Every structure is written in C-alpha cells, then in structure tokens.
CSV table of C-alpha atoms in Angstrom, one decimal:
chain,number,residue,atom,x,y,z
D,296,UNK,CA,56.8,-13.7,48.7
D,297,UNK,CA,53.0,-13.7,50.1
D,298,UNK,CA,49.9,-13.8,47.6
D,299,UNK,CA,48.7,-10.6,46.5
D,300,UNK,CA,46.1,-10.1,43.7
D,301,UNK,CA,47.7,-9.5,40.0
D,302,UNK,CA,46.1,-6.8,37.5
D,303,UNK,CA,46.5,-7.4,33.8
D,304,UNK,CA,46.3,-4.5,31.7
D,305,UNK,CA,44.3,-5.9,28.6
D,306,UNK,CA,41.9,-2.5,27.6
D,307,UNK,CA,42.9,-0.8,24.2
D,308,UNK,CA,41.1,-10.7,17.5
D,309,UNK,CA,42.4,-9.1,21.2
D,310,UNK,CA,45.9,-9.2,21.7
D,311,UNK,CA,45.3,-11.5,25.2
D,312,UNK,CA,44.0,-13.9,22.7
D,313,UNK,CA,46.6,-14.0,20.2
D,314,UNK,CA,48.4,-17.6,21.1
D,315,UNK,CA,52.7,-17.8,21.3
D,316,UNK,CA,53.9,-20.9,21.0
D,317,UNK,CA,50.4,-22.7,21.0
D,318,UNK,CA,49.1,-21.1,23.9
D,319,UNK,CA,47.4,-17.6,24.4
D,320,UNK,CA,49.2,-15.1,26.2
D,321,UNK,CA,46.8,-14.1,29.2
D,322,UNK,CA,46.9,-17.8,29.7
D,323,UNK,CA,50.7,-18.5,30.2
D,324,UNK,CA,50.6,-15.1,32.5
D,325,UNK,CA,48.1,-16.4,34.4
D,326,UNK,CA,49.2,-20.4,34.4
D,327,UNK,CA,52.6,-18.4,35.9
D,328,UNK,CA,51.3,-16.3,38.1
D,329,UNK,CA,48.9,-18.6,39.5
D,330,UNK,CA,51.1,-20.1,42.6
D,331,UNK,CA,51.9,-16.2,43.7
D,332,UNK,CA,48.6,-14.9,43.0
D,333,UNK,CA,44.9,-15.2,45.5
D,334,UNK,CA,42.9,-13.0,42.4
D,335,UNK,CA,43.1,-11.8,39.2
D,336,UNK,CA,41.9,-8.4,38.3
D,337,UNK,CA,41.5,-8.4,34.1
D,338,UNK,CA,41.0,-4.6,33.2
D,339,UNK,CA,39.4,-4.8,29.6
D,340,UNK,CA,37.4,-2.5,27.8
D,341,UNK,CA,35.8,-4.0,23.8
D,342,UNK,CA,37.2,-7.8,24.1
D,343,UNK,CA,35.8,-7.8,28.3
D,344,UNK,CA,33.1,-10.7,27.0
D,345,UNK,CA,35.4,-12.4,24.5
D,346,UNK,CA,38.0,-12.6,27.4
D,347,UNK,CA,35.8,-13.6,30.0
D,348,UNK,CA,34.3,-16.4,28.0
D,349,UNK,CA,37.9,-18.3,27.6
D,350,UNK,CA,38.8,-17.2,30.7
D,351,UNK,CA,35.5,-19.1,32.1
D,352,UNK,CA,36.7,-23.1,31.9
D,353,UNK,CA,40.3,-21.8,32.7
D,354,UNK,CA,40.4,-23.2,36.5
D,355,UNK,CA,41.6,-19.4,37.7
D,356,UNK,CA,40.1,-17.1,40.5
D,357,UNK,CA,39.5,-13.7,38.0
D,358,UNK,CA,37.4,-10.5,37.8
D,359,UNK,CA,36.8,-8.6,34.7
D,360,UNK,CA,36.6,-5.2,35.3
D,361,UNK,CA,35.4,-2.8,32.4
D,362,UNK,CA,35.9,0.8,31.4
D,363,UNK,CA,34.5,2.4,28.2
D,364,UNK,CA,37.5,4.4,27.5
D,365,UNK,CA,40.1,2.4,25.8
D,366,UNK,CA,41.8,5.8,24.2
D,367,UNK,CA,42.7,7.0,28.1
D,368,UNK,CA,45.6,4.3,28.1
D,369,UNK,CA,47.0,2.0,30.5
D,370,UNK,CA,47.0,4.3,33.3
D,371,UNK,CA,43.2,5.1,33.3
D,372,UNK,CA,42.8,1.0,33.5
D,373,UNK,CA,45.5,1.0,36.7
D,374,UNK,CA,43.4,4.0,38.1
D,375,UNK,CA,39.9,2.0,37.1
D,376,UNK,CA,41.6,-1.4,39.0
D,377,UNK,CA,41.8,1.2,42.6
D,378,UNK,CA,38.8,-0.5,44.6
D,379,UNK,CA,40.0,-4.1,43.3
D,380,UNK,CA,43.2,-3.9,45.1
D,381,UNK,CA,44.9,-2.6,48.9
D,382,UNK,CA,48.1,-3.1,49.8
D,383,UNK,CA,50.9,-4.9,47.6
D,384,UNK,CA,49.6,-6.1,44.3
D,385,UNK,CA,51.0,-6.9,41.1
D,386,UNK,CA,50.9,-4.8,37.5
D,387,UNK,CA,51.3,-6.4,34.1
D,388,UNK,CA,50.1,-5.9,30.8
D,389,UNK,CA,48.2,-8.8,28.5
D,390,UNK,CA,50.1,-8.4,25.5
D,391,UNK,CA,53.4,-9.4,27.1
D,392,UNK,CA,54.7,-13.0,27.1
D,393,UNK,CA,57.4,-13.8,30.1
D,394,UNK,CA,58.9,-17.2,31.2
D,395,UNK,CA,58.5,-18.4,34.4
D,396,UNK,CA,62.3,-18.2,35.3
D,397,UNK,CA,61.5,-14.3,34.4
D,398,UNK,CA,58.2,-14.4,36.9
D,399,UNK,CA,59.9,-16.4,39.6
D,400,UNK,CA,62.7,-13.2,40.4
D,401,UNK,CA,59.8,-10.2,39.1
D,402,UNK,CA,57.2,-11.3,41.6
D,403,UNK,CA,59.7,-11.0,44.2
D,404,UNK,CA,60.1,-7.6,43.3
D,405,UNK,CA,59.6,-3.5,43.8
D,406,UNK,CA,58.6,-1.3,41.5
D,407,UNK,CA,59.2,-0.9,37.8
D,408,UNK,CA,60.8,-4.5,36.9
D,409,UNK,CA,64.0,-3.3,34.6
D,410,UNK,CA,65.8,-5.2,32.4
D,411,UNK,CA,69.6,-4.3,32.0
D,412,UNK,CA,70.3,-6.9,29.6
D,413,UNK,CA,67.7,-7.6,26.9
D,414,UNK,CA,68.0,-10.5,24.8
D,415,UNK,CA,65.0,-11.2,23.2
D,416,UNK,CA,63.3,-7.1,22.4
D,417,UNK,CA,64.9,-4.6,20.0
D,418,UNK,CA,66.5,-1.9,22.3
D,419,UNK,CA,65.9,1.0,20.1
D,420,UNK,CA,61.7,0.3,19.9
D,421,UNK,CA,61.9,-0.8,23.8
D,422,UNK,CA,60.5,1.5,26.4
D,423,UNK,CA,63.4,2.5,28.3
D,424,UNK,CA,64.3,4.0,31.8
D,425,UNK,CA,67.1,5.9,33.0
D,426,UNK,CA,67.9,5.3,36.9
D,427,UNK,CA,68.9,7.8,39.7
D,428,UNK,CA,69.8,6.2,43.0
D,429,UNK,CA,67.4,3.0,42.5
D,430,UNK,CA,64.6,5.0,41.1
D,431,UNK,CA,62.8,6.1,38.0
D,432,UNK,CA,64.3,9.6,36.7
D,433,UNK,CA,63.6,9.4,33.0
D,434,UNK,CA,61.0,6.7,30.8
D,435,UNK,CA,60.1,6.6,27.7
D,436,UNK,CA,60.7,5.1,23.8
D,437,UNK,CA,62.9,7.4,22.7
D,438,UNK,CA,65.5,8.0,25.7
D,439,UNK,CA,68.7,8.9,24.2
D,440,UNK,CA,70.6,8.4,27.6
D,441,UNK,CA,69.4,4.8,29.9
D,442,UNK,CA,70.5,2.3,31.5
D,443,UNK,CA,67.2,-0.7,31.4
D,444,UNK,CA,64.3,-1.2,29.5
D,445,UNK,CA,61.0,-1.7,31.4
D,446,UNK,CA,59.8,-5.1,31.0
D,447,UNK,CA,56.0,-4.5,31.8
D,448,UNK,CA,55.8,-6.1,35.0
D,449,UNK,CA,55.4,-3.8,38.3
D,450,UNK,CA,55.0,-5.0,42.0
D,451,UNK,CA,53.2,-1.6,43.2
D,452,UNK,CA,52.0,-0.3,46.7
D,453,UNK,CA,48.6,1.3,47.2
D,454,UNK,CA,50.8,4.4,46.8
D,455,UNK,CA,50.5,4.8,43.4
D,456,UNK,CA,47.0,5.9,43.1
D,457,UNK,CA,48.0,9.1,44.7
D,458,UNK,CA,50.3,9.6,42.0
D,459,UNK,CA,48.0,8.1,39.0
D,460,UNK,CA,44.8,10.6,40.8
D,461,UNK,CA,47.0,13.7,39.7
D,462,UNK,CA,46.1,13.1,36.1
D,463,UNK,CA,42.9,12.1,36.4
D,464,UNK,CA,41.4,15.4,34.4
D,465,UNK,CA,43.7,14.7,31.4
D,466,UNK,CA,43.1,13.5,27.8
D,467,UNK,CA,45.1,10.3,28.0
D,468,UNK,CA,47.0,8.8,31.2
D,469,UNK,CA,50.0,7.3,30.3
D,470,UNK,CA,51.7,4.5,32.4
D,471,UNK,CA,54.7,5.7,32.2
D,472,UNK,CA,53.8,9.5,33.0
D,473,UNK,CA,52.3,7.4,36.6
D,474,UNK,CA,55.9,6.1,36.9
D,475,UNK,CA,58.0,8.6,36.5
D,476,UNK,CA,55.7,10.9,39.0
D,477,UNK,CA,56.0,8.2,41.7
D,478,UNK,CA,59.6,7.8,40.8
D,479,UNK,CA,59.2,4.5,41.4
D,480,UNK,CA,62.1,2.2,42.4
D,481,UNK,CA,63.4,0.1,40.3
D,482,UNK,CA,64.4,-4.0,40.4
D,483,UNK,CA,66.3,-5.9,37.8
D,484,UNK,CA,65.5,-8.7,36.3
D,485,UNK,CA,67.9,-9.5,33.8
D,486,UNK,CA,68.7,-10.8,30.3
D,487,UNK,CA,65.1,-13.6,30.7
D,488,UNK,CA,63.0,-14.4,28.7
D,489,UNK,CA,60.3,-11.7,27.5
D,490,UNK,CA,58.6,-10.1,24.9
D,491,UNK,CA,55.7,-7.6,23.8
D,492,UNK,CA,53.6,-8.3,20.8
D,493,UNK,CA,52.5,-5.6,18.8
G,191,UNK,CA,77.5,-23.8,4.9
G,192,UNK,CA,77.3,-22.9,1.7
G,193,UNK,CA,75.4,-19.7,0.4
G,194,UNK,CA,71.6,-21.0,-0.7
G,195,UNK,CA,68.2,-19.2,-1.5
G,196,UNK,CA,65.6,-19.5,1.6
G,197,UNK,CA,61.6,-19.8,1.2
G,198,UNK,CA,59.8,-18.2,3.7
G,199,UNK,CA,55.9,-19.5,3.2
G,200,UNK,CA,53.8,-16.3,4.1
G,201,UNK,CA,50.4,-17.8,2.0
G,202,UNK,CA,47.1,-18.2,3.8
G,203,UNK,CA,43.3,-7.7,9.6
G,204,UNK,CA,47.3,-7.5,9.7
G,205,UNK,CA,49.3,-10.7,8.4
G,206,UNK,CA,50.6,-12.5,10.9
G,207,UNK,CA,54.7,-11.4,9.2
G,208,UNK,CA,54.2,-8.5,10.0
G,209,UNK,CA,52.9,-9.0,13.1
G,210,UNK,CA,55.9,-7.3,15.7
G,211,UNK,CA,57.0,-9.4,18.5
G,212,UNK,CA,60.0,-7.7,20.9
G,213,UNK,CA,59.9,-4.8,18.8
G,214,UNK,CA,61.0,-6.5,15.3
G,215,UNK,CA,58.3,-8.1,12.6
G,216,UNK,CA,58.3,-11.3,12.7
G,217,UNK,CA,59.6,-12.0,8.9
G,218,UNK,CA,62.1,-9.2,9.3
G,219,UNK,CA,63.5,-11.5,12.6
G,220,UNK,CA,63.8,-14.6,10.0
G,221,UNK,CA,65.4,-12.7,7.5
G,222,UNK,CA,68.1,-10.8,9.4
G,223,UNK,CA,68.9,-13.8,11.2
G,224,UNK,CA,69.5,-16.0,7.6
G,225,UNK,CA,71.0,-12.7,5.6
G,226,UNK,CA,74.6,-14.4,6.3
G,227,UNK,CA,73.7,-17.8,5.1
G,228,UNK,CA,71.0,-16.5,1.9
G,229,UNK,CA,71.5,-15.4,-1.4
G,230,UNK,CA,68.4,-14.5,-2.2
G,231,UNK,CA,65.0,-15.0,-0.5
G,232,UNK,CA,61.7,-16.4,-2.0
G,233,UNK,CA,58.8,-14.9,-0.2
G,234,UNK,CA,55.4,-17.0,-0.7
G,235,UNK,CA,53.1,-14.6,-0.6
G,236,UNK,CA,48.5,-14.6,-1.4
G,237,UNK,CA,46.4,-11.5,-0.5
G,238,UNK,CA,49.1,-9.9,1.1
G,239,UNK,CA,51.5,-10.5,-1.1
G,240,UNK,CA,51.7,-6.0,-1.4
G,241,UNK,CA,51.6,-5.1,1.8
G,242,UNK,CA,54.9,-7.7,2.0
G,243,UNK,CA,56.7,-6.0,-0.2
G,244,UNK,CA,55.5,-2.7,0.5
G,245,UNK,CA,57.2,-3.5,3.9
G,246,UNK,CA,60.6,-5.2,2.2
G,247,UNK,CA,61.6,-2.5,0.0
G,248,UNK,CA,63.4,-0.6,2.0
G,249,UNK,CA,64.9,-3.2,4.2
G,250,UNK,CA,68.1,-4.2,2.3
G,251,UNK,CA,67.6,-7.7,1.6
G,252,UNK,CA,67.7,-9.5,-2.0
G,253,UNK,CA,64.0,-10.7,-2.1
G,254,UNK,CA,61.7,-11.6,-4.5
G,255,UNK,CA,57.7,-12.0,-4.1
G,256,UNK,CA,56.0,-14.8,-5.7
G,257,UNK,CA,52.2,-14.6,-5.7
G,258,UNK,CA,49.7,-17.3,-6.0
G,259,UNK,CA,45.7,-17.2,-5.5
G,260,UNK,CA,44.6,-20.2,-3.6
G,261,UNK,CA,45.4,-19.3,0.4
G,262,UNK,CA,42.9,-22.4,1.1
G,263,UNK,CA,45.3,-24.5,-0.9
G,264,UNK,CA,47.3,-24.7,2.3
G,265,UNK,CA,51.2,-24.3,2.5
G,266,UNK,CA,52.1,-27.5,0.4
G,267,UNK,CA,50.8,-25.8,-2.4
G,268,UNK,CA,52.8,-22.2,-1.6
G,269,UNK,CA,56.2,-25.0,-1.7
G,270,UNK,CA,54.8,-26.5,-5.3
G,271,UNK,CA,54.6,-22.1,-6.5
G,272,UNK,CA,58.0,-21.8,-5.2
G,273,UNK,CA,59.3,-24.6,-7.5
G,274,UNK,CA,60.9,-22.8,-10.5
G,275,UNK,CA,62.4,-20.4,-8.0
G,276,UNK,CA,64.6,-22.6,-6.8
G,277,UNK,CA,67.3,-25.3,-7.6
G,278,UNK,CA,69.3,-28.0,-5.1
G,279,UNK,CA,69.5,-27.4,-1.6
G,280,UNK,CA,67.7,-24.8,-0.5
G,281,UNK,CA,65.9,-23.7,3.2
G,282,UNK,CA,62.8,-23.6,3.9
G,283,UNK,CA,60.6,-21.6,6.6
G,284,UNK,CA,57.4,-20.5,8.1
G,285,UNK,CA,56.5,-16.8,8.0
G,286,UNK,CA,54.4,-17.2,11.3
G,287,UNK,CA,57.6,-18.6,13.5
G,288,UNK,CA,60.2,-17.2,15.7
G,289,UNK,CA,63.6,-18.0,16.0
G,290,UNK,CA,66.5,-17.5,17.9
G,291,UNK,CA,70.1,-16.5,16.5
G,292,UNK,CA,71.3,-19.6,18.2
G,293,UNK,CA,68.4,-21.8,16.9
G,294,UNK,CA,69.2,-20.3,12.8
G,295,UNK,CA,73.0,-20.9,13.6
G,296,UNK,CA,72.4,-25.0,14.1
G,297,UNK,CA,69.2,-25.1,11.7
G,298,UNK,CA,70.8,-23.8,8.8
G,299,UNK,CA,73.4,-26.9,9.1
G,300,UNK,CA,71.0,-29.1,9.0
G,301,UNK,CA,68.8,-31.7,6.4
G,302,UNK,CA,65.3,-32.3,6.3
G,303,UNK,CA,62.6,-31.2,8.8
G,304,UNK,CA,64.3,-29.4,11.9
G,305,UNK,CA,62.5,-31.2,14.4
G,306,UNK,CA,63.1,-30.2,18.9
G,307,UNK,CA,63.1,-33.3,21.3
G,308,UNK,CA,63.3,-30.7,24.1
G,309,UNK,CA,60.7,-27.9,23.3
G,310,UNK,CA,61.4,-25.4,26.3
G,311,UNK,CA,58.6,-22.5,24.9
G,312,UNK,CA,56.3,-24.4,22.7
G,313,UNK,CA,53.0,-26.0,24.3
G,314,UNK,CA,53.6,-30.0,22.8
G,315,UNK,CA,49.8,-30.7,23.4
G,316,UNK,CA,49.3,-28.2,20.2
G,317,UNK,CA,52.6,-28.4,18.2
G,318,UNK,CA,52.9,-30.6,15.3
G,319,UNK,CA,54.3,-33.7,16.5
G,320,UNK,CA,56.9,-36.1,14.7
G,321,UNK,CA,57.7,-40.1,15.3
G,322,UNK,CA,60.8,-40.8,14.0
G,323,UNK,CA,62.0,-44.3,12.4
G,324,UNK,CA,65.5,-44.8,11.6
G,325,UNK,CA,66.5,-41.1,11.2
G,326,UNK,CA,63.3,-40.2,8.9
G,327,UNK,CA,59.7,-38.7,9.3
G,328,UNK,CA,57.4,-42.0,9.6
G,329,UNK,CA,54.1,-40.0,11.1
G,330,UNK,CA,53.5,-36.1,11.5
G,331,UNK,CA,50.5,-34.2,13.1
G,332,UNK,CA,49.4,-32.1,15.7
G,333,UNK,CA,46.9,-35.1,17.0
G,334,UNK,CA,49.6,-38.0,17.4
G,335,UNK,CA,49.5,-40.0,20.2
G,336,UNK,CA,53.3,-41.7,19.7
G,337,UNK,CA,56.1,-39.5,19.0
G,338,UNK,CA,59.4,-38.0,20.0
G,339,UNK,CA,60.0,-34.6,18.6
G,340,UNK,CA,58.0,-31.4,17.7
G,341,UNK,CA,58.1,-29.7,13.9
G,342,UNK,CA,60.1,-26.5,14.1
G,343,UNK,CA,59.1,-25.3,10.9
G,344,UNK,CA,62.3,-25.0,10.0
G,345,UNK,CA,63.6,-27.2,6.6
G,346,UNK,CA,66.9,-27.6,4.3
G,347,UNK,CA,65.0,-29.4,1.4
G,348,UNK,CA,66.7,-30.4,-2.1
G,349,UNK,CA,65.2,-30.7,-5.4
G,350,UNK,CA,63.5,-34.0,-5.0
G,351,UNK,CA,61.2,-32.7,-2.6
G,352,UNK,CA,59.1,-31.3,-5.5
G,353,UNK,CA,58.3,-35.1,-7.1
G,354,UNK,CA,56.7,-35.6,-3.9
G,355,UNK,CA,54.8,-32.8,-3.6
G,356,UNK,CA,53.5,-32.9,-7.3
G,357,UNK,CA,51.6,-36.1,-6.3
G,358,UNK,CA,48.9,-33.8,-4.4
G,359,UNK,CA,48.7,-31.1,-7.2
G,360,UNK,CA,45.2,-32.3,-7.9
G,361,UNK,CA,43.6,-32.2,-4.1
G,362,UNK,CA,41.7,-29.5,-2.3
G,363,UNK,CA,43.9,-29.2,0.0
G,364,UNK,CA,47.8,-29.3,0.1
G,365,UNK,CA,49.5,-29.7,3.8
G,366,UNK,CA,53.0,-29.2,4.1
G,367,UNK,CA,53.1,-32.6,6.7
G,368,UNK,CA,51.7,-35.0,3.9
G,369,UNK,CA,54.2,-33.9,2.0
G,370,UNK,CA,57.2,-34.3,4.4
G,371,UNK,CA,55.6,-37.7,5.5
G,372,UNK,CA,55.1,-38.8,1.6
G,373,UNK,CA,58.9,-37.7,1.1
G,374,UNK,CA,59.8,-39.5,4.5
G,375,UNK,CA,61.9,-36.7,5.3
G,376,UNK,CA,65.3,-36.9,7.3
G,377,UNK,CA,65.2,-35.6,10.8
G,378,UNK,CA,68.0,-33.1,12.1
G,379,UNK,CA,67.6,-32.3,15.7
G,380,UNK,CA,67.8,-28.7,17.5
G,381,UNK,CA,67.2,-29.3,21.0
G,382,UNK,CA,65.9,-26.6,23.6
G,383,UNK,CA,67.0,-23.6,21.6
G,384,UNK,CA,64.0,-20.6,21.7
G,385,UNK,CA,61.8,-20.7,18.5
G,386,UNK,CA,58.0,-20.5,18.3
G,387,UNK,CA,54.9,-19.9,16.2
G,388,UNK,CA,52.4,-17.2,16.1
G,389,UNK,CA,48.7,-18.1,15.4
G,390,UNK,CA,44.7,-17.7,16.8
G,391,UNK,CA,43.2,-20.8,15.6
C-alpha cells in the first residue's frame, strides 16, 4: 500500500486530547498511521492551537487546517481538507481509538471501512450501514435493517469532493449524507479492535 | 465465586463514569459486566455523586451512593468512606477503567491487586507499575524503574485492608498504592486481556 496523506477529523479538554490507556488518542492514530502516511492533514476548528502545541515535539510531518464553523459537521471539515489532498488519501476521525492490527487491514482498504463483527462498540448506539452489491445503500444510527457498522476510517479517492460539493449550501454537512451520495464501496475489517469516545 | 458487594471509586465538565466509550458509559460497562458476580454495588462518589445517580436509577442494578467531601483526599480515602458498607471479601474497582468480559471473568477469581505482566493496550511508560516479591506487592508507582507487572485497577480485598488504610487517616493526601504497598497486597495475574483507563492528566 503506497504513502498517501491521512486527514483526521478533530473540528466540533478536546476529545484528541483525552488520553486511553495512558496515551492520547490523536497520538496512537498518528504513532499507527505513521509508517503508511507522507502528511497529516489535522482539520480542527476551537482546540487548532491546543492541538498543534502537543502535536509540536511529537516527531510527525502535520498541518493544522482551521475552519470557524464547528456546527457544519464532519463533512464541511472533509470539504475544508480539498486543496490538502489529490488522489488516494486517508479519512479518520480524532475521537476514535483503533489498534494497529485494525490499521494494518483498513489502510489497505476502499471506501467506508465496515465492521461485520463488532466486539468492543454497542451495536444499537453504532452508526450502521446496510450494503448493496459492495456499496453503501443505507447509513445511519438508527438503521433497523444492516449488515456493518462503520468504523470511522475511509480510504477515499479525490472523487468524493464532487459528491461532498453538492451540499455545500446546506446548514450542516453530514459525513454520512457524503457517503451514502457517493455510494461508496465498502471493505471489511472485522471483529478488531476499536472504539469511539463520546 | 461466591456472590460479593463491588466498590467502584468514582471520587475526585462531565465525570469521567460517565464518560461513553464504544457507545456504553464507562461505569455502566463495569457494572454490567460484574451484575452476575455482585450483590450490591458501592458507588464512591464527591461532586458528582447526583449526576451518578441521576444516571443509575433507571438502570436496573442494586446500587447505593456513598458521598464524601474531600476529592483531594485521593482514592485511599474514597476505600476508608466505603468501610462500613462492606464486610469480608469484597471487589474493588476504578470508575475511570475499562474492561473486557474476558478480563472481569478471570479478575473476579482473583485476590489482591489484579496486576497484567503482558499489557497489550496500556502505554507501561505511564501505567502504575508493580515489583513483586514472593507473590506480594513490595513497590508500586507510575515512576518505578524495576518491576514486572502493571496495576489493573482491579482488586478482591477483605476486611483487613481497612487496618491498613486507617494508618493514613490523618494525611493530606490518601493514595490507594501506599495503601496496597503498606498492606503488601497479594498479586493475582490477568495477562494480555483488554482493559484500560481513561484520564487527561
């Protein structure tokens, strides 16, 4: 799998910050992601300074990028990270924690990274996808027919900002709204470890 | 196992119980997990002692909320408030941890500190470190240079626990290690199972 730049969603103490298991989530992301990864592109909005000053002695190639409109949601800050990125990149959000047996078979993904077999998140809370012929036909937290849960992580295509452009006029611009509109294929990556903190 | 009370220390913006990781709160993880081995739990609880049981009441657990005000006390003092809620063996846990259904399955068999030789998630550099001597807790800190095994947070303490722990009533500052190092705790292992701690500094 060749080096491509990773976005981290971390716009809207921060939740990057917040430390599992002695060690802050952005920086077990990043300390994973690292080997597969020429640049990160940190989309953060309030926290942007407080990030970028632990960030700073960290050893990692990174950009902050800021927005002022936290409230637009995590697909305004994919649609903010557009002249950051061409080509191949990678798509996760800073208030997930994943192992690096999880990141070793998601960065060698496509699309929406779907989990078939959750063992560590509550199903019912989850946000879940229903799959048509590899793709994304349904998303969302309160699917009452699916097959995976989306795990956060996305190896995209400069593709999407065709799709993500379309709702670019509206109030908030959910992630998942992006997803479904591209109807994005879908990998699995099942049953390791991973977890969102809320 | 037999049936016995748990204490879950939850004592010094949202408290980091209720803080949801996968989906679930963090104390309501811990709880759901011991249900089948607890009688009745013994929440530790300071300032948010009511948003706790606010949170509880609706949950279907037998719980009770005992409230102290001295956070800064640290969580040695929240096991001395606990004392007259309890009687023998009984388990003891942080309200800040993780833990796997595999992890609680082995823990609750075990006797004295739960202690990892194999921490898999955990960062060791940080953790709260244990050297071990002859089956027993001879030194305990985040800062040791010599040890063997990390601090789970997890405990199945008796009675007697509570004449070492007196011996500190009158300090500033009561940490849960001095005790456990003042007892000279047995060590039970749990090796590589998932289990860790949320915090900020």
């Amino acid at each position: 799998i060749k080096l491509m730049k990773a976005v981290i969603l971390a716009a809207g103490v921060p939740k990057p910050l917040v430390r599992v298991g002695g060690c802050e989530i952005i920086l077990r992301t990043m300390k994973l992601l690292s080997p597969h990864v020429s640049e990160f592109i940190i989309v953060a909005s309030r926290y942007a300074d407080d990030i970028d000053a632990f960030l700073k002695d960290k050893g990692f190639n990174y950009k902050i990028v800021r927005h002022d409109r936290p409230e637009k949601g995590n697909g305004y800050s994919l649609l903010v990270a557009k002249n950051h990125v061409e080509d191949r990149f990678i798509l996760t959000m800073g208030d997930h924690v994943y192992s690096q047996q999880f990141i070793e078979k998601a960065v060698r993904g496509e699309g929406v990274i779907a989990d078939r077999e959750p063992r560590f998140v509550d199903i019912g809370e989850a946000t879940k996808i229903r799959v048509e012929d590899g793709r994304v036909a349904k998303i969302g937290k309160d699917l009452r027919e699916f097959d995976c849960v989306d795990t956060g992580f996305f190896v995209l295509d400069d593709s999407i900002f065709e799709h993500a452009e379309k709702l670019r006029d509206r109030e908030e611009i959910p992630l998942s709204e992006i997803v479904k509109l591209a109807r994005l294929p879908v990998t699995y990556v099942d049953g390791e470890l991973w977890m969102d903190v809320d």
